[PDB]
Amino acid sequence: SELIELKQDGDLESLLEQHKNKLVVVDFFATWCGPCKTIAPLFKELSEKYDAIFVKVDVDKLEETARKYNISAMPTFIAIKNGEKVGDVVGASIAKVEDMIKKFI
Amino acid sequence: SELIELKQDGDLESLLEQHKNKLVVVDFFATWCGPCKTIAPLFKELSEKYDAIFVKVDVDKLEETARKYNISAMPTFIAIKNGEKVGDVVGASIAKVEDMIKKFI
Numbered sequence: 001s002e003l004i005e006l007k008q009d010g011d012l013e014s015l016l017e018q019h020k021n022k023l024v025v026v027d028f029f030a031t032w033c034g035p036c037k038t039i040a041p042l043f044k045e046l047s048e049k050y051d052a053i054f055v056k057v058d059v060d061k062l063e064e065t066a067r068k069y070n071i072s073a074m075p076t077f078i079a080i081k082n083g084e085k086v087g088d089v090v091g092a093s094i095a096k097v098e099d100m101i102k103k104f105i
Numbered sequence: 106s107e108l109i110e111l112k113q114d115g116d117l118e119s120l121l122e123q124h125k126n127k128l129v130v131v132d133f134f135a136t137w138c139g140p141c142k143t144i145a146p147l148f149k150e151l152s153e154k155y156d157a158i159f160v161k162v163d164v165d166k167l168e169e170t171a172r173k174y175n176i177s178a179m180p181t182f183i184a185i186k187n188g189e190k191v192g193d194v195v196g197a198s199i200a201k202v203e204d205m206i207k208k209f210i
């Protein structure tokens with residue numbers, strides 16, 4: 001499994017260049033968000049089930065990245081394939097997140 | 106490296122059940138169709154470049170399948186991922202077919 005928690009704007013772009021052959025799935029979350037805390041260990045369980053790169057982004061730490069992907073509602077999950085955003089799930093729905101991964105992996 | 110040409114209605118459904126964990130890309134074509142003949146060898150080239158299941162369906166041999174996928178323009182290419190239709194390309198555009206394959210493979 002690979003599960004990477006980012007620190008500052010620019011970190012996702014580096015990650016994407018360094019993981020070119022693989023689907024990247026990003027959980028945009030906030031420290032004030034309860035459903036984000038509930039879904040966190042389940043997103044970690046998915047990272048152990050699928051051969052993709054799982055990434056966590058705190059929207060208060062990566063504010064320009066949150067803007068780049070038009071992120072509003074917490075959590076939002078996006079799938080990034082060959083460097084482009086291809087799908088999203090808005091809200092804490094682990095079934096939806098898994099369905100999105102199956103569609104793009 | 107699988108390129109499979111079907112024979113009768115029901116064949117696509119058995120194919121999908123037997124190839125459940127790979128992208129399937131179906132070329133719905135007709136014998137009367139000029140663009141279909143132009144793109145055929147280029148579809149075969151893609152089949153030799155990508156690890157997916159490539160399928161050819163003559164709409165006059167698999168009439169109820171063509172209906173079931175609402176095929177109108179010839180050719181039409183359909184991407185199927187975990188058994189659900191996830192994308193299509195209407196018309197003989199080999200660049201857009203390859204883009205579809207990359208997004209879902």
Ligand SMILES: [Zn+2]
Nearest residue numbers: 107123124158
């Ligand atoms: Zn096979």
Ligand SMILES: [Zn+2]
Nearest residue numbers: 104105209210
């Ligand atoms: Zn894949």
